[PDB]
Design a protein around this ligand. Structure first.
Ligand SMILES: Cc1cc(C)nc(SCC(=O)c2ccc(S(N)(=O)=O)c(Cl)c2)n1
Ligand SMILES: [Zn+2]
Length: 259
């Protein structure tokens, strides 16, 4: 298949080849903080990310992905709303065509400039990410909002690479990536049950979205828009926007770890 974010193949078109697009636990959503319920039973996040787990950065045509070696248990998320160990798999980012929008999740009617997703899978129960992606408790994604601010020394590692992966399919070695340090200093979070925000749109994600944004400069974020959604030797299209609109909550509870 050949989904994307352009006029012919974008989010409104996804339902055509992925009927779960209209499902009851679709992501992303609006977080309306006046409707969030603090839940004292939610636990703190327990995070370990080995900077040597990071292997490769590539252009999928839908974002950049930092792939981590997920055959080993070096990089694991536990706690939060999660039962068991969730192995780190991959990091990517969503943004919009300009800095005033671009996050997937929206807070109190407001879009951030971009949103970082840290993809993990239940390695207690499932033999691989591919099997875990089909189960309600299979995935956990940590979301971090990016707002325009000062230049981010931690994102600069990624931005420095983006020219070498400008075309879809291109990849480049990427390691010693201190992912933890990219996180905001508060790990307070909202959580709800949801889906992949991209086709196949599987309802297998425990969303964990951190309240506190991190900064990125205008010039840093603009580098992501210089990525192509098209391959070398193909007609060019810039990956100007790669975010899905908020989906109906359909009676799900968004809970907060904090008050
Ligand atoms: C073999 C295989 C299967 C699947 C379901 N995805 C992939 S690559 C896509 C991928 O890992 C991915 C992309 C986007 C998201 S999101 N925006 O965080 O909900 C997630 Cl959870 C996974 N590969
Ligand atoms: Zn994502």
């Amino acid at each position: 298949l050949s989904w994307g974010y352009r006029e012919h193949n974008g989010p409104i078109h996804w339902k055509e080849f992925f009927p779960i697009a209209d499902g009851d636990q679709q992501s992303p959503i609006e977080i309306k903080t006046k409707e969030v319920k603090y839940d004292s039973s939610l636990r703190p996040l327990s995070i370990k990310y080995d900077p040597s787990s990071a292997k490769i950065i590539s252009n999928s045509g839908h974002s950049f992905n930092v792939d981590f070696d997920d055959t080993e248990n070096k990089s694991v998320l536990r706690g939060g709303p999660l039962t068991g160990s969730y192995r780190l798999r991959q990091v990517h980012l969503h943004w919009g065509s300009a800095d005033d929008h671009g996050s997937e999740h929206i807070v109190d009617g407001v879009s951030y400039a971009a949103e970082l997703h840290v993809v993990h899978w239940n390695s207690d129960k499932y033999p691989s990410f591919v099997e875990a992606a089909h189960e309600p408790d299979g995935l956990a994604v940590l979301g971090v909002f990016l707002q325009i601010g000062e230049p981010n020394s931690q994102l600069q590692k990624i931005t420095d690479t983006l020219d070498s992966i400008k075309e879809k399919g291109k990849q480049t070695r990427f390691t010693n990536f201190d992912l933890l340090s990219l996180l905001p200093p508060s790990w307070d979070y909202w959580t709800y049950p949801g889906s992949l925000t991209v086709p196949p749109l599987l309802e297998s994600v425990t969303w964990i979205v951190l309240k506190q944004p991190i900064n990125i400069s205008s010039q840093q974020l603009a580098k992501f828009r210089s990525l192509l959604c098209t391959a070398e030797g193909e007609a060019a299209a810039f990956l100007v926007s790669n975010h899905r609109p908020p989906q109906p909550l359909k009676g799900r509870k968004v809970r907060a770890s904090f008050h």
